[PDB]
Structure 1
Amino acid sequence: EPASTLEGPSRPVTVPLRHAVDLPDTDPRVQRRVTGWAPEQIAVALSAAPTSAWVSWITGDFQMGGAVKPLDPGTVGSVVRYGLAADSLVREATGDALVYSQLYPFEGLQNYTSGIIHHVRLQGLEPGTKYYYQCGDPSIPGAMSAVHAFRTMPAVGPRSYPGRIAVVGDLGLTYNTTSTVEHMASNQPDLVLLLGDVSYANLYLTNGTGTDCYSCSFAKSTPIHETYQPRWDYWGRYMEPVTSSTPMMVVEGNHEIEQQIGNKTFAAYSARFAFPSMESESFSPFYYSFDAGGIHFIMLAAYADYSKSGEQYRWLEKDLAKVDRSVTPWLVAGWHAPWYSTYKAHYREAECMRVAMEELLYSYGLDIVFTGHVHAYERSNRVFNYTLDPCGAVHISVGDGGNREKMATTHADDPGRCPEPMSTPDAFMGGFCAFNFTSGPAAGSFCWDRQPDYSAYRESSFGHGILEVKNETHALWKWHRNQDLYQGAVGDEIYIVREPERCL
Structure 2
Amino acid sequence: PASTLEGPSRPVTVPLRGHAVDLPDTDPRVQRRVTGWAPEQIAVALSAAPTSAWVSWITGDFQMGGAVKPLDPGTVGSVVRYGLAADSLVREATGDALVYSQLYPFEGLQNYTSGIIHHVRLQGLEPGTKYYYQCGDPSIPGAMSAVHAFRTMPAVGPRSYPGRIAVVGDLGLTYNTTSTVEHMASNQPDLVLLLGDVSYANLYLTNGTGTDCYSCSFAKSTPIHETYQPRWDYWGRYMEPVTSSTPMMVVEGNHEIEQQIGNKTFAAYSARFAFPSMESESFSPFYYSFDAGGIHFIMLAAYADYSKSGEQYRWLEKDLAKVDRSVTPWLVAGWHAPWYSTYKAHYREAECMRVAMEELLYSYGLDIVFTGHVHAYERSNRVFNYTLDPCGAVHISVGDGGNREKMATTHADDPGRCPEPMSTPDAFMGGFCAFNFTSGPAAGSFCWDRQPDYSAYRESSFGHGILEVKNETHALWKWHRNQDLYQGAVGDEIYIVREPERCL
TM-score norm. by structure 1 comes to 1.00
**Percent of aligned positions that are identical:** 100
The equivalent residue for 2:104 is 104
Distance in 2 separating the partners of 1:485 and 1:471: 30
Residues 19-44 of structure 1 deviation map (CA, whole Å, 9 limit, x = unaligned)? 31000000000000000000000000
User: 1:160 Cα deviation (Å)?
Assistant: 0.1
- Match for residue 12 of structure 1? 11
Root-mean-square deviation (CA, aligned residues, Å) is 0.2
Alpha-carbon distance between aligned partners in 2 of 1:329 and 1:201, rounded to the nearest angstrom: 38
CA displacement 1:300-358 (0-9 Å, x = unmatched): 00000000000000000000000000000000000000000000000000000000000
Alpha-carbon offset, residue 456 of structure 1: 0.1
1:138-197 deviations in Å (ceiling 9; x for gaps): 000000000000000000000000000000000000000000000000000000000000
Matches of 1:262 and 1:31, distance apart in 2:
31
Deviations 1:81-125 (A, max 9, x none): 000000000000000000000000000000000000000000000
Residue deviations 1:193-249 (CA, integer Å, cap 9, x gap):
000000000000000000000000001000000000000000000000000000000
Structure-1 separation of matches of 2:323 and 2:49? 13
1:398 is matched with which residue?
398
Q: Residue in 1 aligned with 2:497? A: 497
Alignment gaps of 5+ in structure 1? none
Aligned-residue offset at 1:251: 0.1
1:269-311 deviation line (CA, Å, top 9, x unaligned): 0000000000000000000000000000000000000000000
The aligned counterpart of 1:233 is 233
In structure 2, what is the Cα distance between the partners aligned to 1:307 and 1:46? 27
TM-score normalised over the length of structure 2: 1.00
Q: Which runs of 5+ in 2 are unaligned?
A: none
In the aligned structure 1, how far is the partner of 2:65 from the partner of 2:25? 16
1:405-463 CA distance string (max 9 Å, x none): 00000000000000000000000000000000111000110000000000000000000
Partner SS for 2:249: strand
How far, CA to CA, are the matches of 1:66 and 1:104 in structure 2?
12
Residues in 2 aligned to 1:290 and 1:438: alpha-carbon distance in whole angstroms: 37
In structure 2, C-alpha distance between the alignment counterparts of 1:271 and 1:417, rounded to whole Å: 40
User: Structure 2 CA distance, aligned partners of 1:5 and 1:197?
Assistant: 30
Partner of 1:126: 126
SS at match of 1:42: strand
Confirm whether residue 190 of structure 1 aligns to residue 190 of structure 2: yes
* Structure 1 residues 464-503: Cα deviation after superposition (integer angstroms, max 9, x where no partner): 0000000000000000000000100000000000000000
Cα distance in 2 for residues equivalent to 1:481 and 1:325? 33
Partner SS, residue 143 of structure 1:
coil
Question: Which 4+ residue blocks in structure 1 deviate beyond 6 angstroms?
Answer: none
d(CA) in 2 for partners of 1:454 and 1:341? 10
Corresponding pairs, count: 503
TM-aligned CA deviation for residue 360 of structure 1: 0.1
SS of the aligned residue for 2:29 comes to helix
SS state at 1:478 partner: strand
Query: Partners in 1 of 2:155 and 2:444 — Cα distance?
Result: 50
- SS in structure 2 opposite 1:28? coil
